[PDB]
Design a binder for this molecule. Structure first.
Ligand SMILES: *[C@@H]1C[C@@H](O)[C@@H](O)[C@@H](CO)O1
Ligand SMILES: [Mg+2]
Ligand SMILES: [Mg+2]
Ligand SMILES: [Mg+2]
Ligand SMILES: [Mg+2]
Ligand SMILES: [Mg+2]
Ligand SMILES: [Mg+2]
Ligand SMILES: [Mg+2]
Ligand code: NA
Ligand code: NA
Ligand code: NA
Ligand code: NA
Ligand code: NA
Lengths: 1011, 204
């Protein structure tokens, strides 16, 4: 029947979907969520064999183990074990588009397991198997007899094995298809893998059982009274002596309890549900659930007889909270949310798409630690434990159906086709059925990038109907269609409109007020964090805070989808699209996260943490005003530390308790500050510190900071005049300057500082020269490829204007002696095919003090694309251990991504001055630097710099970080000006005009000296 | 203007004067101006100016130079934005080209006198025998800034001897969203802390 090439057959013999069950036979266990003897795990060592197509599978395999099979761990993705290649493609389907057909060569994973079943499970009751995740479709047999079939790789498929097992050993056989008609609905932008990748379990339920239960919590107007409503359904034989008891506990205290026999109220002319009952429990003063304070109760559902015998118990954690949209705003417990969100895929560099509790916990802790309060399950229902952790740790979740048909043309070709309604329907209804009792889920999503089709509208309504408790969103077809309660665009810019036909991306501020519009706006994806990015992040946050209806967004995305590969030497390396021989592929486009695949943060994470702070500050005088952005909690685990320093020299500091109500203000007065010892800028830095450990942070965790310039006393003190005067030596070839142990050499034919000596040591490996380019960031490159050049990308514009190829032409090189110094004057023109791109005019003044002052004035032709940078660079002879500077830090920071950085004195090992992005590019800059120290050198002024063992040239010629090799010496890039890095998206120019180097004329000055 | 340094050096084809001043108030240094004046065998005087402004002092109205020229000429010819008065936050209507107007048109007769007549984005200014070149904003008239601020009605102003020239490297916006509270937008306030500008003064 080739059920896998028929969207009319998404399953065969599968059981109804339902919330997490465990069939406890002891109620106290159900109360405490302890392991149930009735829910067993089948994870571990299974038998597996790979075949190129289902037709190649031998019939012997149904009844007997194939001798050639290997033993492997389950769950797993077979690509991760090396049986075939994983493929990374973004939009284009990995298979020919010819629905509902799939290729005849269709990788087939034959899994089997021999396992025991105790007779006790078979004497009474029902034994079902549950496959939490099989990608993408499969047939199941038990003891050689066919049981059923299933699709939708991201929801559990359950089958009744009752009539198929026997006491003792039994053998399961699972034939898993890599491609199926379900693949047409699984076009997410991620690695394409397959296999039994989520848990496998066996659950015993009594014949008379709890088959479903839904929990709702409704409130009075001020939230001081709620009613907990639990609708309970059974399967099995109704009998008057049956009862259901629903009890509610807060910790170890029972808050309420109610019992009733089965029999629902009348629904229509034929009566009511004799097999259901609804219990209603009053709760006074409930402790409310939020991501700020995830208060939870425990609902325990007992099915039992009137005489008191328990049949079974099921249960769930309950979060008393209301979610509603009113007057244009999304409210949680009656207060408007400000979503500090992130999209997060289930990805692990070694295990592929297999998730584990440790990784889940690690992500959640980092998220909270970085001021995130919400996650979007891009773009499918997650492993069930995710929801439980979000309930308990506290994060708002957008749960999204596993439906994405991005590669179709037009994108809604399937979603507007009624023949595809059934399959889509199962992906939305089965999700709701499974996840509707989790308080962490606050919004349902109909999927991702599948255009807007009538199937969406029907499904949107179904949800609205079954679960009025949470809003429904969906971005396809323009982000504001009739299938979404929230305007939820992806990559809409703050101020700039992108009026694409049919599905324009309006500026978010403008979108809210279009004629007739009244919904809240929350970006489903924004601030594409690919590579060196997150430029302009603060512009979003400023807009979210000023506009009530701009309720935030989900950054794209949490973690790079890089995979580990091993070299000839067995050393691991981070790989991306095409590294597995996969083609076509979308290369590094799968790496867009705030963290590397191993969870090490990229530099952008600190920017997000700062902008997403929950405390806002203002300074007037020496009075700090702290405003809380929390909606429910008081600042009961926070103190404010303040420190004032003079050019990095600590002058004073203090601590003050913070006692701020949600939404309130606190005024703190700083102590009188004594006058500073010398000239310079005083800087105030404040930090919110949590003194006590929480479930998600260590004692001492810093959750917020801010800085301001205080008084500045400019220096007017004349410098003690040199006891020595430098000597110039003129030669045809060079101008040399000597001062004591120092010597400076300027080549007359190049017009550059070609060498410097300290004692008998040469200081340079390459001369000091102007630099106007950078090893292109992912955002500079966009969709440009050598085979498909995108002429609009910044990289292409620079390349085309000859910025990377320009050669310096000397216009002038002269020397003069002053009363106390030597002055070298140069002028160079960089040209390209007859065009003068830039002109650099400089003066170098070396005085009796040994300092070399460099003054630079650059002219940039108005008609050349604005350059990536304006600065100098050189390769120093030395390699030193530390980098010390007075400027913004400590982490990498760029013009449009420096708000999180603080001005102070920093000292790091040199390696920390290099950010190892997987795809190498310009990196490691630090801006607003007034003093930089390295080895015996010191540079002073007001510049941006980067320092590392890799030249810009090497960075731009290298595709993977693991192939980089340290150069001799150290590459210093010192810039007077640097362009923004952008990131609103990574496939179109996104650097805002204010961060482009369009001034035409630029001036900067550096002093180079000995430390 | 306290003098911090004033030197002279003789070069190959020129004389270089270097200066540094600090403007203070009550012992507080508000601004520091560092300059070099390079006079070459061509007779042109190149002035380079680097100013530092205390971060804690209110952002200043302008950063430039001024003098009262002996000369009174009939016309003002410039290559920059015009022909009418234009300020940083009010210059979109002005066009860049070569303008030439009578002196009096370089003064705007606001009934309540104030700074006025500025022209921005100027690359070359000609007046009498003088020529200034750079990338500056300027105003030129028979009235000093001092006289304008001390006079409440335009009919009371009197032409001073000669001509007052105000040449700025930078000038603050004029604002106007309202006229009773500070209204010049952040991007038009001179808050950069360090400012650089250069001009060449020559005859003809
Ligand atoms: C939004 C959808 C997501 O799956 C990615 O494709 C992202 C771009 O990397 O855009
Ligand atoms: Mg099918
Ligand atoms: Mg037991
Ligand atoms: Mg047996
Ligand atoms: Mg997509
Ligand atoms: Mg390709
Ligand atoms: Mg700040
Ligand atoms: Mg214009
Ligand atoms: Na808002
Ligand atoms: Na991507
Ligand atoms: Na506190
Ligand atoms: Na590169
Ligand atoms: Na006046």
């Amino acid at each position: 029947r080739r059920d896998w090439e028929n969207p009319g057959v998404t399953q065969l013999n599968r059981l109804a979907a339902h919330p997490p069950f465990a069939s406890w036979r002891n109620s106290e266990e159900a109360r405490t969520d302890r392991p149930s003897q009735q829910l067993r795990s089948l994870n571990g060592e299974w038998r597996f064999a790979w075949f190129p197509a289902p037709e190649a599978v031998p019939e012997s395999w149904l009844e007997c183990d194939l001798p050639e099979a290997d033993t492997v761990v389950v769950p797993s993705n077979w690509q991760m074990h090396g049986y075939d290649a994983p493929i990374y493609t973004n939009v284009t389907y990995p298979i020919t588009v010819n629905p509902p057909f799939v290729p005849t060569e269709n990788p087939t994973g034959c899994y089997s397991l021999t396992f025991n079943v105790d007779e006790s499970w078979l004497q009474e009751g029902q034994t079902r198997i549950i496959f939490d995740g099989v990608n993408s479709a499969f047939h199941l047999w038990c003891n050689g007899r066919w049981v059923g079939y299933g699709q939708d790789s991201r929801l559990p498929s359950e089958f009744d094995l009752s009539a198929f097992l026997r006491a003792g050993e039994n053998r399961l056989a699972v034939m898993v298809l890599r491609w199926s008609d379900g693949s047409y609905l699984e076009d997410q932008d991620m690695w394409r893998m397959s296999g039994i990748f989520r848990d496998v379990s066996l659950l015993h339920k009594p014949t008379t059982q709890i088959s479903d239960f839904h929990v709702a919590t409704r409130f009075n107007d001020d939230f001081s009274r709620a009613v907990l409503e639990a609708e309970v359904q059974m399967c099995g034989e109704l009998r008057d002596y049956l009862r259901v008891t629903v009890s509610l506990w807060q910790g170890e205290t029972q808050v309420a309890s109610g019992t009733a026999p089965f029999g629902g109220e009348i629904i229509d002319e034929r009566g009511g549900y004799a097999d259901r009952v609804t219990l209603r429990l009053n709760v006074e003063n409930p402790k409310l659930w939020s991501a700020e304070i995830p208060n939870l109760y425990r609902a325990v559902v007992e099915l039992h007889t009137a005489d008191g015998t328990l049949i079974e118990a099921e249960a769930c954690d309950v979060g008393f909270r209301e979610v509603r949209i009113e007057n244009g705003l999304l409210l949680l417990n009656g207060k408007p949310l400000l979503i500090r969100g992130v999209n997060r895929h289930e990805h692990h560099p070694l295990h592929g798409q297999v998730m584990d509790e440790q990784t889940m916990v690690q992500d959640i802790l980092l998220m909270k630690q970085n001021n995130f309060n919400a996650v979007r399950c891009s773009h499918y229902p997650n492993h069930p434990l995710w929801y439980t952790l979000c309930d308990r740790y506290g994060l708002y979740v957008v749960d999204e159906a596993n439906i994405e048909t991005h590669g179709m043309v037009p994108m809604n070709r399937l979603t507007d086709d009624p023949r595809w309604l059934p399959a889509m329907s199962e992906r939305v209804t089965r999700m709701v059925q499974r996840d509707r009792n989790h308080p962490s889920v606050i919004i349902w999503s109909l999927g991702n990038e599948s255009g807007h089709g009538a199937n969406h509208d029907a499904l949107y309504r179904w949800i609205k109907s079954v679960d009025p408790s949470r809003p429904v969103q969906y971005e396809g077809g323009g982000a504001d269609t009739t299938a979404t309660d929230i305007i939820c665009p992806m990559y809409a810019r703050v101020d700039e409109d992108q009026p694409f036909p049919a599905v324009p991306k309006w500026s978010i501020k403008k979108w809210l007020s279009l004629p007739g519009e009244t919904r809240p706006l929350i970006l489903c994806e924004y601030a594409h964090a690919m590579g060196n990015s997150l430029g302009g992040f603060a512009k979003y946050w400023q807009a979210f805070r000023q506009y009530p209806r701009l309720q935030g967004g989900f950054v794209w995305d949490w973690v790079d989808q890089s995979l580990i590969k091993y070299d000839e030497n067995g050393n691991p390396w981070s790989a991306y699209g095409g590294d597995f021989g996969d083609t076509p592929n979308d290369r590094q486009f799968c790496m867009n996260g705030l963290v590397f695949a191993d969870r090490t943060p990229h530099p952008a994470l600190t920017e997000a943490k700062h902008q997403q702070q929950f405390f806002q500050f203002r300074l007037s005088g020496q009075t700090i005003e702290v405003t809380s952005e929390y909606l429910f909690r008081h600042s009961d685990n926070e103190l404010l530390h303040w420190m004032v320093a003079l050019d990095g020299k600590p002058l004073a500091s203090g601590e003050v308790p913070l006692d701020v109500a949600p939404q309130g203000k606190q005024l703190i007065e700083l102590p009188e500050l004594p006058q500073p010892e010398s000239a310079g800028q005083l800087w105030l830095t404040v930090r919110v510190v949590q003194p006590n450990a929480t479930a998600w942070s260590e004692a001492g965790h810093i959750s917020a900071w801010q800085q301001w310039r205080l008084a500045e006393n400019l220096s007017v003190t004349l410098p003690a005049a040199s006891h020595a005067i430098p000597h110039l030596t003129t030669s045809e070839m060079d101008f040399c300057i000597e001062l004591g142990n120092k010597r400076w050499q300027f080549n007359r034919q190049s017009g550059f500082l070609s060498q410097m000596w300290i004692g008998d040591k040469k200081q340079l490996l390459t001369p000091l020269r102007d630099q106007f380019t950078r090893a292109p960031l992912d955002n500079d490159i966009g969709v440009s490829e050598a085979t498909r050049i995108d002429p609009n990308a910044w990289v292409e514009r620079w390349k085309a204007a000859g910025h990377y190829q320009a050669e310096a032409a000397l216009l002038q090189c002269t020397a003069d002696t002053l009363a106390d110094a030597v002055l070298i004057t140069t002028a160079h023109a960089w040209q390209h095919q007859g065009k003068t791109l830039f002109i650099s005019r400089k003066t170098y003044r070396i005085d009796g003090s040994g300092q070399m002052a460099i003054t630079v004035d650059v002219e940039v032709a108005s008609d050349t694309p604005h350059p990536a940078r304006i600065g100098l660079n050189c390769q120093l002879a030395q390699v030193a251990e530390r980098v010390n500077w007075l400027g913004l830090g400590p982490q990498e920071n760029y013009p449009d991504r420096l708000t999180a950085a603080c001005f102070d004195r920093w000292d790091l090992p040199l390696s920390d001055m290099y950010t190892p992005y997987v795809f190498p590019s310009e990196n490691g800059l630090r801006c607003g630097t007034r003093e930089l120290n390295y080895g015996p050198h010191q540079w002073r002024g007001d510049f941006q710099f980067n320092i590392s063992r890799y030249s810009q040239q090497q960075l731009m010629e290298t595709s993977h970080r693991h192939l980089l090799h340290a150069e001799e010496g150290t590459w210093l890039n010192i810039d007077g000006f640097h362009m923004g890095i952008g990131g609103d998206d990574s496939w179109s120019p996104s650097v805002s005009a204010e961060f482009q180097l369009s001034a035409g004329r630029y001036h900067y000055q550096l002093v180079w000296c000995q430390k």
